[PDB]
């Protein structure tokens, strides 16, 4: 049982990771500046003995004593404040590697499938601390994820179809809707992160869901699961064999169950905003 | 139309203050470290042209350019030291800021001076006398309304929750003691009147209308419409009436209704 | 035998605290910024092996290794309101941080006037005791006189002694039937020491419960000075807790303490001629 | 006539840039920590009125007053962390400086973007968009000439070294090389242009490695036995009126003269 | 009428300098860490409108706005070297930022840190255009001087007041020249407000023998003390460039200094 | 075998000391800001196991771990010079204090500015902080890597001689290897008081000029140190014959000029 720092812990992925590691009996310390995350995402844990929330910006040196660091502190966007994003990914990662070096923590970087800005150099910084300072690093290349606590108003397709469907709005299908998307449910991703953190694989690893559907196939499925009278209008798949083999990991959450849950969250939010 | 800093802006009173000053077409900057306040209390304004949210702890020096400062950054109740540092070091910093850029500063003091909020007042008058800073001091009494802290064990909060949760209403004593409660919009109006007046001495902002603890328990039980059993076990604003022409105008029932709506919509969200 | 930090150690009360503890063979270190204190009040120890003066301001972090801190640093007034407050608040936090880090016991020299910055300083100590386990001691001190007191504060005692020595009229406001309790300094100093070495963390009044009337003080001093000064018209301390918890109580009789304060005021007035 | 900061000014390209801007009577200030550059590369200008050398690390904040900044502070290749810090933090600092004093900033980026120089480009455009800083971005391709690194194991360096020292020339295809003064011309044109988007600065003319070793073999004149992405600059030609004018032979002669005067000094 | 900083202002010479410049209606600000000086040397001025006392160590950067600086701040051998070097740099840094003229109270002892201090002054002058004046001060005496330093004037006065024997090393034929403090302060002001940027000696050319001194002091005090046995300054440059010279007759100065030592000795009862 | 810090290591004397201490298998760390020194003076050692070059200004605090410090960091820019000699020197004594290192001050025969107080600062640390210190009072040295363009007499005659330029008093010159041997001898002894390290052997301004004229082979037209304390306390003395020393210095002046055509 380990003392774990999660930067970006109050965000979409960070909060679900937090829930998981607290249930597993670890001392989870969350660092977040609430630039894109929410205190509500982790409030359930405030006061519990093995939890602590620190309102800190990773661009500022952080001194704490831990065995692991899940480095997830990076804002997402539809880029809202490009300079702050670039500062966070670079200076932010250097500080968390500095911290990892001083106290001997293993650090996992939440990288992105978008490497195929600031997250490219971030991977490189990890590998430079590994090679040069003996820091243990793990690098996850994360693909499209969805679920409760995701950003609803970013203009991604899952968020759009879910909002439009709940609001009786027409579901806007760009193109012929034959193009394809692959979505992983957040608990699968969390399972992947933990597995990669505790493996011995220091090279990059893709965590995504290889199963694709057509954008339209998605729109019809969301329409049904919501049960709205909404109308439909018109206007790089992940390879996870390295995770299947090295980590014995793969997404197991059926798509319908993942969407049901995301929908329950979008519904709860929309009524709350009344 | 003025550039206004509201420290503690993301809290209960601070957020309602924010709404009103944005509706009036001012440039509002909210500073808050979210120790007791919430981003949700101000999210409606993020992105808006005349608005900005800064995640800053007032215990740290803050450099910004403004004409007014509503200094409300003080936690309610936990971490007694952080509280004392905030009321003292925080207040010194905001006055330093008021001094350097010539802003008028209003301190959200409390009827509890009749810790750290006493010295804060003293610190304000010392900057006025010694450095010519313009200061205003509001002595705030019991307030309630949407976005208040539900789980503090305050009486309005307990009764609304118990009534909403079908639970019995706990009346300590015979419930004949009395309380005076002010609705949040009334307080916000009062604060603005005090900020823009010429009165630098302390001014009470509260509601003189008193009710019995039991009348409150009874009134809330009815406005909620709960089958809850009831079990058993004053501000003087005449200086505000005359110097500011201010007074609470929200009838108790209307205020309680809005607050009950908030507690409910909240309880549903946490299900 | 201890290592003791006295902040404000060059002031009226500080210097006599320093005298006693020094004579007791402790490692006394004085910290003072001479705002209202005087190098002369300690100079007698400069050079001696177990003493050290450090020109420091308590609003600035201080790092040092001690067993105890007698925190007496707060300027006397009749002056610079902002500085007094930063000192009572920021200054006290630092010495409380200092006591936390090195495990020192901190005695706060508080005041009877709590019945500014002094009130929240008490709170600041009890906050650190609860939250951080710092051992704190809180003394509520009452009117104090003696050598090295401030002479031109226009307190009643300094005024009567001043006017008396100068042959001036003694100015008694109203009928002088109002009353004051005064405590001699060595009594206060013994009380602080007893307090700092007891197990009482709750506040302990230190004062002289023996009241007198303003007219009587003026009369008595007049008699002790033997001047041709004409008199012209224009909350008691409860120390039972200290008697019971510390076996302490003022034992220096008024006139003896008055004589001594007269001898100091005289020596000064001559020096300044 | 402008006050100009050149980071990495004491380096291979930085120094040739330095020469030309001085000759033009500007107040050139060079910043360099001598991690890969050499004081010798700029010593001639020390003392001249319009010149100054500051031994400073761009990873540390720099407060100075200029109209322009040529940001060339990037090590060539060793110490991966210092390199990444230099490229990211160093660059942020220079944009901050550019932001505070209203200086125009040109980034000496690399053809290798087709590390830390990618994000460096991005940081620049974010300051353009967010803080209104004027930025210019040059994508530099293989350059050669006097003051180049002789012992990097690049091919031009190898063949010259091997040839002068009678060594066999190790030919393991085509490469396109640009002479350093042409690049300098480009840098200056782009800096004073209005093109804020990226511009390639390189020489499109290719030869085979064997063709090179032979040209070098002859230009040096040794009996050494030989053993065993082209740049598109049409955008510079059109927006800057720039193009390489130094013939490959003339450029190699100059580089060979440098390597020859260096080996002798190390005898 | 000028805003004047006096480092070491709370010391022997600094306070007399402080006095005279306050008498002249200037805004005098004193900086002192009370390492060798006393709040008493200047308390007479605390509260006055044109005065301020700042408890500051010149080894720490100091930011203030002034037209002049009399740098007299000089006293544990290391603190001494730091004060003379770093202290002086800081005061020149300040002089540069605010365009103040700076006077260095150097010493006749250059014929440590006061040698290099001079070099630093001329270096800021030459390189940054800071205006500097440099006084080479010879032996000074008077009220508020250090009594227990073991100087000869100090010893003889103390021994004489206390009936102790007056300890004269050698046959007492060696010679010393002593300047009274009020002369020196005038000397300092004349040099500050001249255009002479080169060094200037401020001392009393008048010499006497040590034995001659002990006898003069012995008479002016009137004690039954027994006498036991066990570089003259050239101010011609000051006479001509500043029209300055000591005017306090030796007797009058010694009288005043003796009064101070006496008043102090009773006070210490 | 000792971990040695050498400030000014990239300078004329600092580098030869650097060479000689490396050949001896010590862990040499050079601190230099390249104000008057050259990276080239030490590049030969870059990469080697017992060596490190650090670009640091001694006026800024330096934190490192060593057994010894040869403080030669001293350079035109008078303020910077005085700052380097005073604050620079305080730091190296501060550092020597924190890590218990022995410190050597490369002082100069000119104490007979900023190098006077340096001596003064060192002894204050010895006395007050028990820091062990050594002080060498160095006279005029010559050799490869010297500042050629200083206007010293040997330098002037060599430049004039090496360039066909036209060229009764005594000047005493010490060769660099001699100085270096002397410095190490002073470092690893127990004499903490000042020691003159120079060459007592004198020649005439006129002899020198005649000697240089011939050693170059051009058509060119034409306070003595007391080291008895060093001879005795360190058993040290200059051994490099004047001609051989001049030859090496001349060879340097030549290689540089050609490098500069
Ligand atoms: N969501 C995806 O599909 C996806 C895809 C690729 C990569 N990722 C990576 O996973 C991580 C989490 O993504 P997410 O969707 O949960 O994003 P998110 O916006 O929900 O969470 C990021 C969290 O980091 C915090 N943060 C941002 N800047 C910070 C700073 N300077 N200091 C401290 N905290 C800061 C934010 O407030 C937020 O709570 C990110 O690093 C992201 O790049 C996610
Ligand atoms: N609500 C009442 O009944 C009442 C009564 C008397 C006085 N007041 C005063 O009115 C003001 C508003 O109080 P409230 O009840 O809305 O409390 P609140 O907790 O809702 O608001 C306090 C806000 O200030 C912020 N804050 C706390 N510490 C801070 C720090 N160090 N730096 C920056 N921000 C910080 C908190 O996050 C919070 O958002 C307070 O000053 C309070 O003392 C309120
Ligand atoms: N004398 C009384 O009758 C009386 C009554 C009640 C309380 N007290 C308390 O006793 C304590 C001492 O009082 P006193 O009569 O000795 O007053 P004093 O003024 O003689 O002593 C205060 C000392 O603290 C020093 N000081 C002030 N600010 C400082 C700072 N920021 N840093 C360092 N030193 C600083 C002053 O120079 C002075 O020497 C005080 O805390 C006071 O409030 C005294
Ligand atoms: N050589 C090429 O053909 C080529 C190709 C692509 C890009 N570039 C770019 O051109 C620029 C110069 O290239 P070059 O061959 O002249 O490189 P170089 O190594 O000759 O020069 C880089 C200079 O920057 C200095 N420097 C490095 N880190 C520093 C720091 N932290 N602070 C201050 N100074 C620092 C070095 O000491 C050196 O003099 C670089 O940005 C490089 O990326 C060159
Ligand atoms: N008295 C003489 O005969 C004589 C002779 C030659 C030169 N001087 C020079 O005149 C100047 C004043 O002499 P003095 O007799 O008044 O000496 P002094 O010790 O009486 O005065 C020096 C003052 O400077 C202060 N000081 C010392 N170090 C300080 C620091 N780091 N920061 C701030 N203040 C500090 C001391 O507290 C003291 O008040 C000195 O520079 C001295 O070198 C005096
Ligand atoms: N060579 C001589 O004739 C001679 C004679 C007597 C004394 N000395 C002394 O020996 C020492 C070295 O002499 P040199 O002839 O080798 O000089 P040099 O100029 O060749 O070397 C001095 C070195 O110190 C470095 N330096 C300067 N300021 C610095 C700072 N602030 N931080 C770090 N490094 C800095 C310079 O870059 C230079 O490399 C000097 O202290 C000098 O005074 C030399
Ligand atoms: O630039 C360099 O040459 C050096 O950079 C780093 O050293 P440094 O960057 O000084 O310190 P790090 O240990 O890398 O720390 C990096 C950053 O993390 C921050 N940090 C450090 C420790 C910590 O607990 N928390 C924390 O936020 C510090 O602010 C620091 O700026 C490397 O560790 C060295 O190998 C490298 O040679
Ligand atoms: O101690 C003293 O004697 C002096 O203390 C203060 O001066 P100071 O605290 O230095 O500066 P202030 O402007 O009073 O600032 C108070 C605090 O506010 C902070 N501050 C200042 C300015 C600002 O814009 N923002 C800000 O957060 C500073 O960190 C500072 O700690 C008083 O203003 C002076 O009257 C007083 O004489
Ligand atoms: O604000 C908070 O939440 C924190 O406030 C304090 O921590 P902090 O004020 O950071 O540090 P302290 O150790 O209490 O020191 C207070 C001050 O004393 C000063 N200090 C500390 C140690 C020392 O030896 N000397 C000294 O002057 C420091 O400058 C510091 O500003 C409490 O100790 C923490 O429990 C609390 O979590
Ligand atoms: O090192 C250098 O090359 C430069 O050193 C100095 O510049 P610097 O010492 O950085 O700044 P100064 O203006 O000389 O200030 C010296 C000291 O004075 C102090 N200072 C400065 C300004 C002030 O208002 N008050 C004050 O006490 C500062 O703490 C600083 O450490 C010289 O001014 C330059 O001519 C020189 O070229």
Could you walk me through the main structural features you see in this protein, from its secondary elements to its overall organization?
Chain F: This is UDP-glucuronic acid decarboxylase 1. Chain F: It catalyses: UDP-alpha-D-glucuronate + H(+) = UDP-alpha-D-xylose + CO2. 6 copies of one chain form a homohexamer. Chain A has 274 residues and is an alpha/beta fold. Chain A has a single domain, classed as Rossmann fold. The first copy, chain A, has 8 helices and 13 strands. Chain A has helices spanning 12-23, 82-103, 119-133, 157-166, 186-197, 215-226, 241-246, 255-272, and strands at residues 3-7, 27-32, 51-55, 68-71, 106-112, 137-142, 145-146, 171-173, 180-182, 184-185, 205-207, 212-214, 232-234. Chain A has a 7-stranded parallel β-sheet with strand order 3-2-1-4-5-6-11, sandwiched between helices. In chain A, helix 1 links the parallel strand 1 and strand 2 (27-32). Chain A is globular, with a radius of gyration of 19 Å. The A-D interface holds A 79, 81-83, 86-87, 89-91, 94, 117-118, 120-121, 124-125, 127-129, 131-133 and D 79-81, 84-85, 87-89, 92, 115-116, 118-119, 122-123, 125-127, 129-131. The structure holds nicotinamide-adenine-dinucleotide (NAD) (6 copies) and uridine-5'-diphosphate-glucuronic acid (4 copies).
